[PDB]
Amino acid sequence: PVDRSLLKLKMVQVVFRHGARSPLKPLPLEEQVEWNPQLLEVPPQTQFDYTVTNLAGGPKPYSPYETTLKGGMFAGQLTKVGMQQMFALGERLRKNYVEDIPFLSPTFNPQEVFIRSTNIFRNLESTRCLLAGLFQCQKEGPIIIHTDEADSEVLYPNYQSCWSLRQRTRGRRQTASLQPGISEDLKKVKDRMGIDSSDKVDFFILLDNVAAEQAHNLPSCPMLKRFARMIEQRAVDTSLYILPKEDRESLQMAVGPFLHILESNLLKAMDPDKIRKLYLYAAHDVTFIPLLMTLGIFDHKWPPFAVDLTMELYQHLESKEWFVQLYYHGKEQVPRGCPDGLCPLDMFLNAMSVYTLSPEKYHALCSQT
């Protein structure tokens, strides 16, 4: 049995989803909840200055990611609720890696921390809020957030960029809401809520709105709230239909390169001045689902706002063996291939390699020929 007191924390990697936001698109009905732009006001406690570069980098890329909704607020925007969620996540990280053990400096140190986010604004602001919470708005040096162009982006499954992935999922994506039991429930929900059959709606849009409204405690349609759990379950069912656990090639192409990044970071520990103690990645629900599945930890719930997957790397001070410990939303996990929560690094990497994709192999697998 391993004595944890002989375990020394080496590297931490945290992947997270942005905080609560406004829905991407509203439900098609006359009476909608009011989304007030007042929700956009930044809590002063969360203010942290930062700049954005490409992976180089190097100039920041242009962002393709327009819709104004009832109340005047824009779609897909991070609210003060989400800002507070992320700040809270940062404070949990501070509790773990700063206070309880002095692994990280209490003030932000550019050389201790590598920061990457998708080029979307709500992720960037979520990152700022997390940093604000973790470091209590203290920096010894400027905060730099690295992002990539949307076409190269590996932080979410990229269908636009990866042709084979698109081709492998296209049929199922077309028919996803027509599947048995998904279709009946969808019709049932649209009917009970008085949504027209002439409006095109699926469990993704439903879940988007119910989760956004519940997160903000808004005066939602009581029937929508009543269906919340089945709506979430059916969204999950739809997502898994489009990309099932059994389709390995698709998973590889979906999260494979991201996994490859996490693995690379683990490997930097095997071997100076370029060493980071903390790696942060701002990502999306669509990243989390297949990610969790490949790690064999998926709980069949939509990944929540501000959810995080935290990966700790330890080295035993006596044996000099290495171990990985994985948490999801603050709860300890046992990834597949692992004897238990404290997983020998070699077993962990061997397990992860089932789905891992290097840039070369990704590019090859994705291309038409």
> Which residues form the catalytic set?
18, 285
Cα of first residue to Cα of last residue in the chain, in angstroms, is 50
In sequence order, what E strands does 148-210 have? none
148 Cβ contact partners less than 8 Å away, ≥ 6 residues apart: 54, 55, 61, 119, 154, 155
For residue 110 the two structure tokens come to 């550019």
Distance between CA atoms of 55 and 119, rounded to whole angstroms?
Answer: 11
Nearest CA-CA partner of 153 in 117, 125, 123, 127: 117
Residue 317 gets which letter from DSSP? Answer: T
Which residue is listed with tokens 């599945």? Answer: 293
Distance between CA atoms of 80 and 83, rounded to whole angstroms?
Answer: 5
Q: Strands 343-344 and 322-328, how do they pair?
A: antiparallel
